[PDB]
Design a protein around this ligand. Structure first.
Ligand SMILES: NS(=O)(=O)c1ccc(-c2cnc3ccccc3c2)cc1
Ligand SMILES: [Zn+2]
Length: 257
């Protein structure tokens, strides 16, 4: 099936998911001089104080932390959004080297990794229905650069040993995702897609201007995870990112001047 290797990677996905060549695909390059400041954009509202994490899991393409989304516990509102989006999971994309790994780029610059906090629009009732709607999901994207450690990320790094291979999961309760956010909530926003199959064009992208810094030891532990399942030939989980896609008939808006 699909992956990130030479024979099943992003250049192959369109054969099983022809929307890969669609009109609003993600990620994209964010050209900061062409993005337009939109003074009508509201401030983001990130309400994570009641977030209830459940599990952390290696799904063979990334690792993700899942949340209880059966109530309005951790929600994203405001910014470009109408209505209320519940946090379902977060995951990362990262590189084999510090100079690559992010999916979005900024003036063609690549960051060492990118964090995706995935939310879905409660008016559609469940995430499966939301992914079939043009305004069904809202993904908050946060760049990672290598520098000082991010203390709020360390509890995630600590547990990666226990989910080395595809299919492994572990308890990951009482994790506070507010510890992954940068200081500023300034953002770029554009309509796009999931960046993995099924590549559904259901995502309002909200990409934060300010990266977070993580330490080389923290990102190194990402790179020790495995694409493969236990007992199979070891393939390190690195470079699980989709490259920038054509912007086509879209404008990126900025919340800040
Ligand atoms: N990398 S990303 O754009 O943030 C991303 C990519 C794919 C998903 C995803 C995958 N499978 C799904 C199946 C059912 C419902 C929602 C899904 C979302 C969710 C998030
Ligand atoms: Zn992602």
């Amino acid at each position: 099936h699909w992956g990130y290797g030479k024979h099943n990677g992003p250049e192959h996905w369109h054969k099983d998911f022809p929307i890969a060549k669609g009109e609003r695909q993600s990620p994209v390059d964010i050209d900061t001089h062409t993005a337009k400041y939109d003074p009508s954009l509201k401030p983001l509202s990130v309400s994570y104080d009641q977030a209830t994490s459940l599990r952390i899991l290696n799904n063979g393409h990334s690792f993700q932390v899942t949340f209880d989304d059966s109530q309005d516990k951790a929600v994203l509102k405001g910014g470009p959004l109408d209505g209320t989006y519940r946090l379902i999971q977060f995951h990362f994309h990262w590189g084999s080297l510090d100079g690559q790994g992010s999916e979005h780029t900024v003036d063609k610059k690549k960051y060492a990794a990118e964090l995706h906090l995935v939310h879905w629009n409660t008016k559609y009732g469940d995430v499966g229905k939301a992914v079939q709607q043009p305004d069904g999901l809202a993904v908050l994207g946060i760049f990672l650069k290598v520098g000082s450690a991010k203390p709020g990320l360390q509890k995630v790094v600590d547990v990666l040993d226990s989910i080395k291979t595809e299919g492994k999961s572990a308890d990951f309760t009482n994790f506070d995702p507010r510890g992954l956010l940068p200081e500023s909530l300034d953002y770029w926003t554009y309509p796009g897609s999931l960046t993995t199959p099924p590549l559904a064009e259901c995502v309002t992208w909200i990409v934060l201007k300010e990266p977070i810094s993580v330490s080389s030891e923290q990102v190194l532990k990402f790179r020790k995870l495995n694409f493969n399942g236990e007992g199979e030939p070891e393939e390190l989980m690195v470079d699980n990112w989709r490259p920038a896609q054509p912007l086509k008939n879209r404008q990126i808006k900025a919340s800040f001047k």
